[PDB]
Amino acid sequence: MELLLLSNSTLPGKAWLEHALPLIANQLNGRRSAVFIPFAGVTQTWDEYTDKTAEVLAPLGVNVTGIHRVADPLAAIEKAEIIIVGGGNTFQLLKESRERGLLAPMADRVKRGALYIGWSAGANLACPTIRTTNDMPIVDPNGFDALDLFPLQINPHFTNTREQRIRELLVVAPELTVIGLPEGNWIQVSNGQAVLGGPNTTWVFKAGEEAVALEAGHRF
């Protein structure tokens, strides 16, 4: 499988997705057709959310269509080469994806070879559940299970308290590995390898285990 899981969309003083572009270009391998899943977004229209993405990705050879702007979103996902899931509120992203019947189709399509790109809430969505979001529960998504494409739990926007909240999750779910993925960092899953990248310190939390700092290039 091919995933790019970004903690966040925009580095300080940089353009939205700028740090992601070389990573995407390296991973596309000729893919062009993309669907954008805008449903995490709340305060911006989805329509407008889809254009920013198309703007910066069109030069990379990516044709982005918003899944809210196509007549048959299930078929759009089934035919897409790339699934792009933006940031915003993770609960609303999951609620809409579930209610619209798109969650299993997106997972199936990535399993069948599509590239998945997600940042923020879209990185959460790739995991088994959304239990490690920082977001407020503004809507009930009717289940916390998510795409289950990446087997570890990501806590994006990580900064430490946050470790104590993660430690409570590890009491109720002691089998989990939680990755505190700071802004600026990402996990790129490609050609059979999950690789950490970015300049800030990443942490991993497991039950009963002291926090472990992970270096850029670490392989999960």
Side-chain angles (χ1 to χ4, degrees), residues 47-64:
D47 303 18
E48 178 171 297
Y49 201 15
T50 301
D51 296 340
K52 276 190 162 240
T53 305
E55 244 162 63
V56 67
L57 300 190
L60 284 64
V62 179
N63 182 44
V64 175

Side-chain angles (χ1 to χ4, degrees), residues 186-203:
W186 61 86
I187 304 171
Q188 187 163 42
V189 183
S190 194
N191 178 25
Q193 187 110 166
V195 186
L196 182 63
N200 293 319
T201 303
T202 302
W203 295 89

